[PDB]
């Protein structure tokens, strides 16, 4: 349905400049998105190894990787095969700001999902936790997704945590806004998507590479 | 009743505030289900009503013991009973108005009543917007995320909270709570969320500008 | 002398407040300079001393009557007295802590003196932080932007500020206010700028918690 | 000094995607560089008309032009020939963000400054004023501009506003490092930088084409 099998393929082409570093990173995935999980590899082929932690792109890199409930329209599937483009600002507590930019499109052909992807920050602190790579994971998250009625478009809202090598947080404010290409004919009510999102480094002597795996449920508002 | 809870008990509020510039007093009275996370609370504003703004604001303003927590997850604050705890919020609402909230609770085991102290300010809302207008319908439900902060002995809560408009649109605010125990706490709980709903209902009249909130919280892990 | 101001006045001040939950009453007296912006205040903590906080935060909360205008700048402030004015105004700091400020401003023609009634409050200051830690200097001087709201009647005042810290670093700060004449002014200012600079002698010792500010300010149009 | 003539020449590369909008921008311009004024014009040379309004990018196309006085250190003439780099962070009443990042250097030979900017935005409302655009000018501004002691670098605090055609104010948040690609010998103490930003739109049929000029000054502390 809507270009999709349970289990399929995927590619990414991250574009990026990080406080002033340009840098181009690709990957490919296995995702299951009825289940809403999904794992890829990623490696730098432009400007590694990276002057900054790996962890600040991991959400730049698909809310079709979602579990919804029959009840709740699945705006991201919806949209396919043509797929929606999303924009989303992120907001550190210490005063770093990263905007990033995709275009999602299915291939029914391939039965693969290709995934093309601007990035850009500044102003991180140069001996901050990012620049210094201290970073270990994004905590668990619970992201408030909302129609927005007359545009036809959805908003993004969740406040992230990034885990310290010392055991503190690092707070990060996504807003996102998620567009499909198409009109889409139902929307949905509000509701939250929870998410678990993880990272290890496969580096190596040559490329800098590693591997993310998420798993997104959506679930209502309830109670 | 090991904290000076009870499974049925009985509430009470005393709210000073300031609003921009306008100063007001409320107190109320209410039953709550500690255990069962509902509470049910009557407000009456005795002095300076009837608000020049929205009664919403105020509500979140009004009790973290009033939660469900499942048995795996450390109750910090029923434990913090029945000496009790206090808080301090801060709400950043999207068009730049900023408020403050301090609350003080404790319980008297003597009247199996729970004591609230508010002290509310806020400053800086348009004249034109939402809340000067009384635009407001209600606090939309939520989920906030609770975290220790281990060597402070603390927990802090961070939500995004939603206010529905009559138009059928959203305001947004933002609250970034610290909860501190008055009593050094032994256990502390691992980061958890706290979903919340809370409605209310304007219960006024010629003589007395009045009102009803009914909260449900309860608490969970991350679902994954 | 046409708004009950001299060349040469008096103030006072009470200031009620709570910040991270601890209350505290503070007063003072000054000698003013209205016309050349000049003005020097000693203030005296008179109940919850010693504070378990940074004196600086509470600086810019005890007046822009004490503003040098360029006569081609209509002077709001003064243009509001004897009856005066009140402000509200939010603090924004960068290790995420929130004070909001409410002021009201008013002149004894039979006094000469200008009467200050500040309630403060503020929340979420880390513990570890360089106001928890009285690690503080002096606020920076500075630069506010100072805006009309035509149709409200009022003021709009904003400026990031600066606190320096003992090490040498700058601690940040968003400051903004709303200034409302008590009366409905006739002349609205044309936006413009103001300077300040406001320096800090704490006087203290085993009796009373005490301390000297010194503030001076002068407003200018943009200088191109 | 520091390869730099009272009267200069310019030219300006925006590459910039906003609200999912790309788009290239080039400009030329005659400046100032000790008088602190300057005046450039500028084309779209891919993805115009824009669908969104011209000021927003004012801001993306140089401190060098700024007159400094003998005893406030010139951190930016200074940083020149080689030049020095800036990214930027802006933040709009209404959600939206930008971030900007520019590397300005100067041919000796062509007497020529050359600005290569990058430009990204998300999250601007369909309907605001920006992408319905409704602006005519930024109000002028008195910038917060502060040394780093140990980082060797500048930072740039301003609360911008952009007036709406109906007589209201936009605001905006500007954030800005500004970082030498030399070592600097001497610092700044901190300063205030004033300026006066206009645009008059010069498009026609074909291009579009409007021209930007500014006056900056520094100032100190005083009082």
Same mark, same amino acid.
């Given at each position: ?11 990414? @082409? ?6 002033? @570093?340009?840098?181009?990173? +690709?990957? %490919? ?7 809403? !999980?999904?794992?890829? =590899? ?24 979602? %579990? ?16 929606? +483009? ?6 550190? %507590? ?16 391939? =039965? ?10 500044? =102003? ?14 994004? %905590? ?24 310290? !090598? ?12 998620? !567009? ?14 929870? @998410? ?28």
């Amino acid at each position: 349905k809507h270009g999709l099998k349970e289990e399929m393929t995927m590619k990414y @082409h991250m574009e990026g400049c990080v406080n002033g @570093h340009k840098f181009v990173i +690709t990957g %490919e995935g296995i995702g299951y998105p009825f289940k809403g !999980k999904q794992t890829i =590899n990623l490696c730098v082929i432009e400007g590694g190894p990276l002057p900054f932690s790996e962890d600040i792109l991991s959400a730049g890199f698909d809310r079709i990787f979602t %579990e919804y409930p029959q009840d709740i329209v699945d705006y991201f599937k919806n949209s396919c095969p043509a797929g929606y +483009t999303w924009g989303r600002s992120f907001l550190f %507590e210490d005063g770093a700001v990263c905007i990033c930019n995709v275009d999602i499109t299915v291939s029914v052909k391939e =039965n693969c999902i290709y995934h093309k992807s601007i990035f850009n920050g500044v =102003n991180f602190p140069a001996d901050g936790p990012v620049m210094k790579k201290m970073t270990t994971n994004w %905590e668990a998250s619970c992201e408030k997704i909302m129609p927005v009625p007359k545009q036809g478009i959805l908003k993004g809202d969740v406040s992230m945590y990034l885990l310290l !090598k010392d055991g503190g947080r690092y707070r990060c404010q996504f807003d996102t806004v998620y !567009k499909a290409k198409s009109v889409p004919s139902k929307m949905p009510e509000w509701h939250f998507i929870q @998410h678990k999102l993880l990272r290890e480094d496969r580096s190596d002597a040559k490329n800098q590479k590693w591997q993310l795996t998420e798993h997104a449920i959506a679930f209502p508002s309830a109670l």
